[PDB]
Every structure is written in C-alpha cells, then in structure tokens.
Design a protein around this ligand. Structure first.
Ligand SMILES: *[C@@H]1O[C@H](CO)[C@@H](O)[C@H](O)[C@H]1NC(C)=O
Lengths: 49, 48
C-alpha cells in the first residue's frame, strides 16, 4: 500500500502445513521496512524463479 | 525516572512521571496508548 507518498509494507512469515488454497486461521501482520518513495504506482508484477 | 517531569520525546511534548514499562513494544512500534487514547508510553529516540 502507498498513501501520501509513503509506501507501507507488512510482512509475516510463519511455518504451516498446507496443500493448496489457503488455511483458515488468524494471523497478525507486522511492518517490514519504511520506504518514502513517493511515486505513482498503477501496476505490479510477481517475480518467479 | 519515578519523578514528575516535563518531557519532550521525538517532538512529542508532555508532562508526566517516566517509568520503565513492562510491555514489550515491537521495534517499529513506539507510542503506546490507553483506553483514553492519550499516550501511554513512548520510546527514547537516542538510546532505544
Ligand atoms: C498514475 O498514473 C496513471 C496513468 O497515467 C493515472 O491513471 C493515475 O490516475 C495516476 N495516479 C496518481 C495518483 O497520480
């Protein structure tokens, strides 16, 4: 998310046993870094290996 | 600590008794608040 020229990222990494789709449970997301980029962003891509 | 003092921490001006809080703040989380929404606790910007 980006609001008022300030980008916000929220990262949580926990181990889980999952096959496909998504498990039903609760999680509390916490911030990762602070990036005052201040740029228009209309699109995004997901890099893969 | 343990005395009534006027403190300005990270541009936040306030007056109150400063004590060591047992609550564990996240590294990013700084200003704590009570039910009244007034600031419950802060973080020293010099020595965290
Ligand atoms: C970002 O650029 C796109 C394409 O020019 C435009 O449609 C959109 O309104 C712009 N958003 C902002 C916040 O300027």
């Amino acid at each position: 998310k980006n609001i008022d020229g300030y980008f916000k990222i929220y990262s949580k990494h926990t181990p889980i046993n999952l096959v496909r789709d998504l498990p039903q449970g609760f999680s509390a997301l916490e911030p990762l870094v602070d990036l005052p980029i201040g740029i228009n962003i209309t699109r995004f891509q997901t890099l893969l290996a | 600590k343990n005395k009534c003092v006027n403190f300005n921490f990270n541009g936040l001006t306030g007056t109150g008794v400063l004590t060591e809080s047992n609550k564990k703040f996240l590294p990013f989380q700084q200003f704590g608040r009570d039910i009244a929404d007034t600031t419950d606790a802060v973080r020293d910007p010099q020595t965290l």
